[model samples]
Target: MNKLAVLYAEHIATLQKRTREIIERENLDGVVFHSGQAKRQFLDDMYYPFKVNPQFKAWLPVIDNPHCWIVANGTDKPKLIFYRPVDFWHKVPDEPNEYWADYFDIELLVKPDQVEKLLPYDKARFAYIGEYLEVAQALGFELMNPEPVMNFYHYHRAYKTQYELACMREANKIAVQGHKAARDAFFQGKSEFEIQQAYLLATQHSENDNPYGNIVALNENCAILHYTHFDRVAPATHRSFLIDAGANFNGYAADITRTYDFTGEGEFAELVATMKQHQIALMNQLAPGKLYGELHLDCHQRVAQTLSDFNIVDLSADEIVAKGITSTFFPHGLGHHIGLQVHDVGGFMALRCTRKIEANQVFTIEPGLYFIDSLLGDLAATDNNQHINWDKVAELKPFGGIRIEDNIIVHEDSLENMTRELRLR
Candidate 1:
């Protein structure tokens, strides 16, 4: 088998063991393992113990119907009901005499609003598995919120399981190569689209897929976040270009954004230095137990102080804080959790411990400053006649925006900087 295949087997064995441990600890009856296509894609490689265990009984009817349901006082061995939409509707092929009843030993055919018919005897406490709320309600089974459950599962799964980390590390290594290629394209007078194509092509050559659409913004274009409209060209006179891109390894993705100044001596150079300083400061402080929301607020305060130091705000620190001046340049949250999905799951879910910076949790810390003309226009037109100094803002406008984003893994005492090389190059 390949390395990934071997890893998959080991991961599955680990999950099985973990599941059994959790089950035994909770003193619960068997869990109902549901299988959808997506779930299968994620878990099939590593969840065989649950499937073949003698203790595991199938709640729903299938070829592998290991029946054990609630009897009088206690229940039978823990059961797994693997149900998909296809299982219910579609007929099995090549079985001439087979019917639905023939495939499933139907103890009770539960329909919608037919709970009384399905379970005449009272069900004291039974764990409902899967994301289907309708089945849980109809069967009168206690439902567990899947988000928290999945978040718990993901938390255990997110720390890269050794092999996954190696994949991500290699993915990032290739990604930085693509970053360099993109940077070289910018200096070679390529359009935003051309630079994007170059970066993607480089990644593809390295056998990695572009994680998401690349952002190639020159001059004022960097001010626009989520700017994928890469048709614009960077003028030869343009001082800097912001290229934000990443690569996907298996299902995981790594995102990194860097600003490159072609001139290396203009306002772009100065802005880059200032942005890097704040970015590094934010990175240095990130660790487990820090609330990202509070950290973001602190970042806002620092940015406000930075602006005051640069004389862009033209107000005292106390005055800026009172007036909420930090919101002007540094809008948006500091960063978000990143993993399986780009803006991965469990960032702000209530049940998942309120998104406290936990060990092994990976996220981005992207603090940016945008000198948006339209935003400044609105602020200038405010009724109170209080706003950022337009002249100072204008001087910064040509540089457009300065953002340094890096993926980080929260550790106990320190943090892992996943996108460190992206920033340096």
Candidate 2:
């Protein structure tokens, strides 16, 4: 058997077993997942692009083309109601690829009404997973998108299988190529839009094709948490560029970020380097029993120390942390899970799934420092109280912010650094 076939068999086995337990635990007879249809562009037949629901995507390897369903009962060959549409104008349909299909009892249909005929259970015995509730009602099913069961799936999604890891690694590799091109564009004094284009050109991606909306910030724009604009004009006095972006492979994503220094010898570059040094140390602490919440505290303390060392603020590192001053400049959570979605569920390094970290779990480690126009406008040079440090604030304000983000895989003995290799160059 080919690699896909072998791996898919294992995947199907695991999925079946876990789902059976979930069904029993949640007090449901079975689960039904629908590959959703397209939504109209404000009432036009020309529909918005359709992407299969991730919940449905989890059960099978089919990532694109919707209008399909999966029915998983306690211990049976899962029934897949596959939709094979007949199209005349730009119609793309899914065919049963043996590598994944040999495991499923797939039945093909060409019409919308056919979907209801496949619903064997009346309603209450089955729980539905999809965007279409109207279909669920028409099929005479009662339970729709139950949270208790979803939390179980979300809890497991944090841990990726071997096949999933391979996809994530490929995504990182493809994304690094674009990052290098982006750095080159920055050095050439290109505008934010031009730099963004350079990265896309290197990766051969369009805006719609990107894994996440690219954060291509020049100068002061980086200070905004999720800076959206791609300014077309190059700054006359460009000092730094921060791009928090990534690319995808097989729906698996690489959510990577890099902050750039315009000149080789700028003070901002040293700060970026310092942040990276600490980032590497943090990556080394990922062990099987490590609590991510503690690691998050470590991130805050380290960044706090950096701020105090640079004389950016008056308080000592611990003092700043104690006083909640650290929250002023560095407010967001440390990082989040990364996979099918950029901030893939489970938790924000949360304790919901499991209190401690484990092998095969994947997520991003992004710690940032920003001095926004308002938040830090009143920050002071003080020994025990808030006092004005407007001059120092103004000097650092133009550069906007600095953030270093990378994807990591927690292994039994070691952590896999998926995006750090790009930072070395």
Candidate 3:
């Protein structure tokens, strides 16, 4: 067998062992993971992009195919219920015979209702995991995604297998190339739409294939955290560019963001360099056993210090943090767990991520400093208004903001900066 097949064999074997343990612990006989069905737009004939259930993709890596299922009974190899409907209107999924195919006992389903016979006899003991509750109910399943089972799966999903890491590495490689192309387009005075197109072309990925919508923002647009709208017309003067994009490899995802300066000089440019340094310094502090919440707070302190060091605020670093002033410039979490999904599970429970860092876990470390008007306007009216440096903020407002993000893999002693490994800044 080939090297990837060898890896796949080991990966599947490990997953099987984990499945056995999970079923035993949860008192479940089996788990039926549905690959999710595509849904049509509201009152429209066109269907939204088909996204596979992360639970199902964790096992099969068949991302685009919907209506597929996997029955894992723990003792035997997982059974894949491949869906290939006899539809002349659209293309059908290819046969489930690939490098990882041997690891599964595959069966074909021409119709959705045919899956009942292929499942195990005792459906009551099996937990259904997917978006389609109607199908699970029709299949005579009592346990439709028990929270305990989901928690168990989500908690363990954070710890990636070697195969998953390999796929993520490839995904990062593709995204880094795309970022380079996007940066070139920005320098060439391309519009937001043109820059996004350049990135898609360089990565050879259709817009739907991306893990998330590409955030190709120019100038002040970067201040908007999730800027996605593309302006066809380039601004009269480009001050900054921010492209937050990623690629997919075998169902795994890479989430990366980079900010670029127009003139490559001035205070905004200096802030960009400072922000990149902050990300690196924070990355250097990552290690096994550290709590993600603690890291997040540490990033706040760093941002507070940046405001003081750059004379953007007329207050000491400790004083700024004490008054919660850093939130004005740096909103949002420092980063998130990234893997199969862009914002992968198991990082946070509600707003806080008290989870301890562990080896083999992939995540993102994104530190941002934005010149958002609304947040600053609120701060301006507060009693702490005296601490503000309004003149400096105005000068940098045209440049938008600065955010440097990188994917990292936690190791026993050190962390791997996946984005930096490709020599991207």
lDDT of 2: 0.80
Q: Which residue runs of candidate 1 sit more than 4 Å off their true CA positions?
A: 1-10, 21-148, 154-160, 205-208, 232-236, 347-355, 383-387, 421-423
TM-score of each: 0.67, 0.92, 0.96
lDDT of 3 by residue, 1-425 (tens): 57667777778877788889989988888899999999999999999989999999998679988889999976798899988888789787578668988888899989877889988887999999989898789889989888877887787788888888888899999999999999999999999999999999999999999999999999999999978799999999989999999999999999999999988998888899988998999888788888888889889999999999888999999999999989999989998888888988874322256778889888799999999989999998999998888898888888888899999999776788999999997
TM-score winner between candidates 1 and 2: 2
- Which is the leading candidate under TM-score? 3
Clashing pairs in 3: none
The deviation in Å at residue 398 for candidate 2 is: 1.0
- 21-126, model 2: which lDDT tens digit per residue? 9999877889999888878898676987677788887766676667888988748999988888777865755578767787788888788688877777466779
lDDT of 1 by residue, 165-242 (tens): 555666677778788888889888888888888888887743224667778898888888778788665565766688
For each of the candidates, the C-alpha root-mean-square deviation to the true structure, in angstroms, is 10.3, 2.7, 1.7
Best by lDDT: 3
Clashing pairs in 2: 380-387
Residue 52, candidate 1: alpha-carbon lDDT: 20
